[PDB]
């Protein structure tokens, strides 16, 4: 799963079978990393108009 | 794939299915790759 963003700690209660989270736009919203099995939140990097 | 979903619900009703809602969480995915058209349940006998 390729993408760009800021990876932070998450407080979302992922069930054990659940791997990743998805938003309305079908982009990944959270991920469970291998080798640690901990739940990471994915937030897009800052952007806006100039 | 043989997908199995399960949920344990503690009940206290006598005969029929309790009326409510409870989602079933998956247990295991089994890469069987086989043909299935029939199924049968396994029970246990009680001998005194
Ligand atoms: C390796 O990954 C597995 C998950 O497939 C995990 O249970 C295990 O803790 C990992 N081992 C190490 C040393 O990170």
UniProtKB/Swiss-Prot annotation, chain B:
It comes from the Viruses. Changing residue 14 to G: In strain: Omicron/BA.2, Omicron/BA.2.12.1, Omicron/BA.2.75, Omicron/BA.4, Omicron/BA.5, Omicron/BQ.1.1. Glycans are attached at residue 35. Changing residue 23 to V: In strain: 20A.EU1. Changing residue 16 to G: In strain: Beta/B.1.351. Binds to host ACE2. RBD also interacts with the N-linked glycan on 'Asn-90' of ACE2. Cleavage of S generates a polybasic C-terminal sequence on S1 that binds to host Neuropilin-1 (NRP1) and Neuropilin-2 (NRP2) receptors. Interacts with host integrin alpha-5/beta-1 (ITGA5:ITGB1) and with ACE2 in complex with integrin alpha-5/beta-1 (ITGA5:ITGB1). May interact via cytoplasmic c-terminus with M protein. May interact (via N-terminus) with host bilirubin and biliverdin, thereby preventing antibody binding to the SARS-CoV-2 spike NTD via an allosteric mechanism. Attaches the virion to the cell membrane by interacting with host receptor, initiating the infection. The major receptor is host ACE2. When S2/S2' has been cleaved, binding to the receptor triggers direct fusion at the cell membrane. When S2/S2' has not been cleaved, binding to the receptor results in internalization of the virus by endocytosis using host TFRC and GRM2 and leading to fusion of the virion membrane with the host endosomal membrane. Alternatively, may use NRP1/NRP2 and integrin as entry receptors. This is Spike protein S1.
């Amino acid at each position: 799963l390729t993408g760009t963003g800021v990876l932070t700690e998450s407080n979302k209660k992922f069930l054990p079978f659940q791997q990743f989270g998805r938003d309305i736009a079908d982009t990944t919203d959270a991920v469970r990393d291998p080798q640690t099995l901990e739940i990471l939140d994915i937030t897009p990097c800052s952007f806006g108009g100039v | 794939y043989f997908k199995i979903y399960s949920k344990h619900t503690p009940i206290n009703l006598v005969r029929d299915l309790p009326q409510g809602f409870s989602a079933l969480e998956p247990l295991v995915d089994l890469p069987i790759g086989i043909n299935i058209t029939r199924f049968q349940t396994l029970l246990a006998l009680h001998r005194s």
